[PDB]
Amino acid sequence: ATETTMGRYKKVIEITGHDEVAAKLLEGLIDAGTRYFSKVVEMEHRMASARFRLDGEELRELTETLDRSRRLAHESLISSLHVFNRYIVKEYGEELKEAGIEGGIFPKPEANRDRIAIADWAGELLTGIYENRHR
Amino acid sequence: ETTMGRYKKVIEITGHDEVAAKLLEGLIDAGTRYFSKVVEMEHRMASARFRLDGEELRELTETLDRSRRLAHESLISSLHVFNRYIVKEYGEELKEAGIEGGIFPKPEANRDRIAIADWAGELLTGIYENRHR
Ligand SMILES: [Cl-]
Ligand SMILES: [Cl-]
């Protein structure tokens, strides 16, 4: 189970979920994830479409506002992740290692500083949760 | 024919029209709000399954499901308001492009068709995965 994004996420909940601080920090991480997802989609959609009706300067201004806001959201995602994993490793590091998910919720050792891999990871987690939504 | 293909064609056909564009931004926003709400609700349930007894968990689940229904109704409304506009105003361009039903697949008496929540997931996931790096 724990090999997958979804498996590691569910193990993190099982291991750390009784700690109220860990719980709140993880709620915050998922929220930072949906925020970044939302800003990316909002932007990408507007970049696809705004060209069919905005002049160059209007488009330039819009592009910059969306761009800066998306980047900030990405930095917040990254910070939320790092802060959460540092906490759970500090407090449950042994349990995590025993469960096969040493280092926490992120599947990488190598790429946990990688802006695009963190964005890829967030997409996978959020997609999996959405697709597994209960009937 | 794909979710993303039809979305792209819809922008090409209707992008110049500010009223269409505004309604479509609305639909995309409602879709992301729905997706976000479902994720947060599912996370809450996953965390809560370990903290609550079965009665408490059933009440939580019912609260979340009701809220989800009401947000789903809202998504449907945004899709309808947008799609009825483009179908009325660009019906023949849509026909010519092979997407007569607009941004969502046409109804069929023959087979099932994609659930709206599934469609929205496909559309939003597709836009995310194809983002500029
Ligand atoms: Cl690891
Ligand atoms: Cl069709």
For A5-59, give the secondary structure using H, E and C.
HHHHHHHHHHHHCCCHHHHHHHHHHHHHHHHHHHHHHHHHHHHHHHHHCCCHHHH
Q: Is the dihedral of CA A119, A30, A134, B25 positive or negative?
A: negative
| Resolution limit, Å | 1.8
| Both tokens assigned to B131 | 């983002």
Domain count for chain B, please give it. Answer: 1
CB-nearest partner of B39 from A18, A48, A126: A126
Residues 6+ apart with CB under 8 A from A47: A63, A66, B132
Would you call B15 and A49 a contact, using CB atoms and an 8 Å cutoff? Answer: yes
How far, rounded to the nearest angstrom, does the alpha carbon of residue A83 sit from its chain's CA centroid? 12
Would you call A27 and B46 a contact, using CB atoms and an 8 Å cutoff? Answer: no
Residues 6+ apart with CB under 8 A from A60: none
Judge whether A29 and A98 are in contact, CB under 8 Å: no
- What CA–CA distances, in Å, run from A38 to A135, B87, B90, B97, B125? 24, 27, 29, 29, 10
Q: Which residue has the tokens 């997609």?
A: A127
- AA identity, residue B2: T
Q: How buried is residue B116: exposed, middle or buried, by Cβ count under 10 Å (0-12/13-18/19+)?
A: middle
Q: Which residue has the tokens 């915050």?
A: A28
**CATH code for position A7:** 1.10.287.800
Angle formed by the axes of helices B18-48 and A5-16, nearest 10°? 50
Q: Is the dihedral of CA B124, B125, B130, B133 positive or negative?
A: positive
Q: Which residues on chain B are in Cβ contact (under 8 Å) with A42? A: 28-29, 32
| Both tokens assigned to A102 | 């040493």
Query: Which is nearest to B36 in space by CA: B68, B79, B82, B77?
Result: B68
Q: Is the dihedral of CA A50, A53, A54, A60 positive or negative?
A: positive
Q: Which residues on chain B are in Cβ contact (under 8 Å) with A52? A: 11-12, 15-16, 21
Query: Which is nearest to B3 in space by CA: B130, B114, B81?
Result: B114
Write down the experimental method used for this entry: X-ray
Q: How many CA atoms lie within 13 A of B67 on its CB side?
A: 16
How far, rounded to the nearest angstrom, does the alpha carbon of residue B44 sit from its chain's CA centroid? 22
Query: Which is nearest to A26 in space by CA: A135, A123, A125, A115?
Result: A125
What is the CA angle A46-A77-B79, rounded to 5? 35
Residue B122, H or E segment: helix B116-129
Judge whether B71 and B37 are in contact, CB under 8 Å: yes
Host domain of residue B131:
1-133
